[PDB]
């Protein structure tokens, strides 16, 4: 009856979180990617990240909601049919402050700064998925992300956030018969904290910040978690290709 | 070939400014009024103004822009064909500062609070166009809550009266500005608008504001019967402007869904 309509850019980080929420709630949505394969200056998507500062927008009957967090909040409060998976516990549920604490913590990461740093200072990356020729174009023909010290700070701040997540995932291992059906970050169900986390890890991979932070024996619960979400059906269906620079 | 798409609510104040800008620039736009003739609780548009959910959105190719001021700024910067009227002076014009000053002065007015004030405290209006029944819809603890609600009302009236006096100060400045335009203009010839001869974004904001103040019942306090006669003449003129009448001619008419 009442259509759900989303306007968004496939490769915007905000939108990827919105789209995964929609799929995790199994909502039918008429999704419009308005990004173009090539810009005026014949640049592809990966040369145009965290440009503009615009936000995705949802239209649902009479309601118009801009910005990913507000759209996600609106979807959760609005689609309450019993068959619709909830992604937050009840507002007075035991764990509500835990899910929300992590969600805000991850949603606070300055991803826009990690990206321009990836390009401006590729020396701090490992196996960046952005071609080297972006470093030369977005520097020659062009706070300040240019502060290498700043980037090294927030990367250490990211280290702090992921220690917290790593601890929390060890807690899921102790508490659960570790054989059988494993839980997610905050408990048995996939939450809004999982979307923020899954999408964040995937963008860090894209930028070359996965190996500095996990792998090679570092943060093994996080490595395991990332590998799990990659095989999750909704994630793979919605975001499986979003790091692939061959796909417009 | 790259459509302009607008989603909006017809009777929302922000939407009206946007759609008048589009008409004044003669742009082709696919406009979606997403508002419903009747709500769940069988209320029509003029009982849902106390809504606090009205931000329009423009989609234009790869761009998504929310909120009236940002959308209007985008329209002005983007549509530069020589047939397309400009509604701001060039940034290096002697006139740019006066237009931008008035535009910001008008856009800073707290319109949502005037409308909530209109419904909560109709005694402070004269000839409000909202039916009175939109007001009526919106021993130990028996004395606690009585006193508490008494205090809230006292504070909100003090607030409403405060911003109503601030509206008078803004409109005094506007009256003086229109007095200058009148002094400068031969009584037979092309009458100017607020900031000069061209219709600008400051005129858009003034016109839609005046028309909404009329609807809420805050016009007779501020112009008419000898008060601010230049402002009254301006308002009567803008009601006759073709673009205004086409886009907004009926937006105060509660008979029209």
Question: Is residue A183 domain-shared with residue A109, that is, in the same domain?
Answer: yes
Q: Which two tokens stand for residue A248?
A: 């417009």
Pair A132, A17 in one domain: no
Is residue A149 in some structural domain?
yes
Output the domain CATH number for residue B38: 3.40.30.10
Same domain, yes or no, for B66 and B103?
no
Sheet holding A30-33, edge to edge: A30-33, A4-8, A57-60, A63-66
Residue B38 and residue B97: Cα distance in Å, rounded?
Answer: 44
The CA–CA distances, whole Å, from A33 to A19, B61, B63 equal 11, 10, 11
Determine contact, residues B239/B51, Cβ cutoff 8 Å: no
Cβ–Cβ below 8 Å for A55 and B64: yes
Same domain (yes/no): B37, B129: no
The answer on A233 and A181 residing in a single domain is yes
Extended strands (E) in B155-194 = none
Query: What's the resolution in A?
Result: 2.2
Statement to judge: residues B171 and B117 lie in one domain: yes
Residues B51 and B29 in one domain: yes
Q: Look up tokens 């805050």; give the residue.
A: B218
Domain count, chain A: 2
B7 touches chain A (CB under 8 A): yes
Q: Let me know if residue B257 belongs to a domain.
A: no
- Statement to judge: residues A109 and A221 lie in one domain: yes
| Nearest alpha-carbon partner for A184 in A234, A218, A246, A112 | A234
Task: State whether A59 and B35 contact (CB < 8 Å).
Answer: no
- Asked if residue B132 and residue B211 are part of one domain, the reply reads yes
Nearest to B237 by CA among B217, B219, B213, B211: B211
Identify the residue among B8, B32, B57 best suited for mutation to test binding to A, counting A beta carbons within 10 A and taking the highest: B57
Are the beta carbons of B9 and A52 separated by less than 8 Å?
no
| Residue B139 within a domain | yes
What is the chain B residue with the closest CA to A3? B34
Last residue in a domain, options B65, B86, B107: B86
Out of B38, B57, B86, pick the residue that ends a domain.
B86
Burial of B105 per CB tally in 10 Å (0-12, 13-18, 19+): middle
Select from A22, A46, A78 the last residue of a domain.
Answer: A78
Q: A72 lies in a domain?
A: yes
Is residue A204 in a domain? yes
Q: Does A91 fall in a domain?
A: no
3-state helix, strand, coil in chain B (%, to 5): 55, 5, 40
Structure tokens at B29: 């736009």
Indicate whether A41 and A122 sit together in one domain.
no
Name the residue among A36, A52, A66 with its Cβ closest to that of B55: A66
Assess if residue B253 is contained within a domain: no
CATH of the domain at B176: 1.20.1050
Asked whether residue A141 is assigned to any structural domain, the reply reads yes
Asked if residue A106 and residue A67 are part of one domain, the reply reads: no
- Name the nearest CA neighbour of B59 among A60, A238, A55: A55
Residues of B in contact with A7 (CB under 8 A): 57, 59, 64
Domain that includes residue B38, residue range: 1-86
Q: Does A61 touch chain B (CB under 8 A)?
A: yes
Residues of chain B contacting A55 with CB distance shorter than 8 Å: 64, 66
Pick from B41, B35, B39: which is nearest to B11 by CA? B35
Triad B187, B208, B5: Cα angle to 5°:
125
Looking at the DSSP bridge assignments, the partners of residue B60 are B4, B63
What is residue B108's three-state secondary structure? Answer: coil
Residue A103: CATH number of its domain:
1.20.1050.10
């Amino acid at each position: 009856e009442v259509k759900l309509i989303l306007y968004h850019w496939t490769h915007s980080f905000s939108s990827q979180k919105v789209r995964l929420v929609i799929a995790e709630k199994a909502l039918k949505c008429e999704e419009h990617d308005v990004s173009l394969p090539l810009s005026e200056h014949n640049e592809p998507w990966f040369m145009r990240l965290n440009s503009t500062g615009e936000v995705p927008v949802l239209i649902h009957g009479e309601n118009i909601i801009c910005e990913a967090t507000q759209i996600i909040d609106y979807l959760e409060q609005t689609f309450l049919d019993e068959r619709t998976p909830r992604l937050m516990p009840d507002k007075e549920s035991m764990y509500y402050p835990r899910v929300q604490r992590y969600r805000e913590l991850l949603d606070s990461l300055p991803m826009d700064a990690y990206t321009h740093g990836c390009i401006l200072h590729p020396e701090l990356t490992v196996d960046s998925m952005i071609p080297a020729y972006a470093t030369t174009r977005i520097r020659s023909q062009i706070l300040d992300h240019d502060n290498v010290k700043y980037l090294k700070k927030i990367l250490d701040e990211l280290e702090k956030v992921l220690d917290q997540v790593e601890t929390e995932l060890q807690r899921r291992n102790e508490e659960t018969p570790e054989e059988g059906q494993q839980p997610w970050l905050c408990g048995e169900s996939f939450t809004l904290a999982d979307v923020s986390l899954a999408v964040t890890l995937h963008r860090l991979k894209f930028l070359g910040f996965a190996r500095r932070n996990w792998g090679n024996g570092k943060r093994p619960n996080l490595e395991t978690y990332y590998e799990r979400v990659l095989k999750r059906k909704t994630f793979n269906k919605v975001l499986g290709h979003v790091n692939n620079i061959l796909i417009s």
